């Protein structure tokens, strides 16, 4: 849910002392998954078959 419930997870303790506490590392969402082949030039002349 909550950054502070997560710090409490990190503490293992209910109880929180004054300070600042490093919990996790944030993490930037993937987007727009892309596969981009190059300019296409010279393909089979299948009609010749």
């Amino acid at each position: 849910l909550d950054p502070l419930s997560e710090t409490k997870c990190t503490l293992k303790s209910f109880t929180v002392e004054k300070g600042i506490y490093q919990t996790s590392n944030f993490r930037v969402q993937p987007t727009e998954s892309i596969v981009r082949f190059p300019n296409i030039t010279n393909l089979c002349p299948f009609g010749e078959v």
Binding site: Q22, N25, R27, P30
Partner: protein, 48 residues
């Protein structure tokens, strides 16, 4: 000394939830390492 910050896991594999299973299924060694590097960081805040 330089006070680091480390995104341990993502170095440890880099964006694989499958990994994270394998790591929590390996333990919490990266966690001990983070505590070590926070202890460094406070030690040299204190040193300064």
């Amino acid at each position: 000394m330089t006070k680091t910050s480390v995104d341990c896991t993502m170095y440890i594999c880099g964006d694989s939830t499958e990994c994270s299973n394998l790591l929590l299924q390996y333990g919490s060694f990266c966690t001990q390492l983070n505590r070590a590097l926070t202890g460094i960081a406070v030690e040299q805040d204190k040193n300064t």
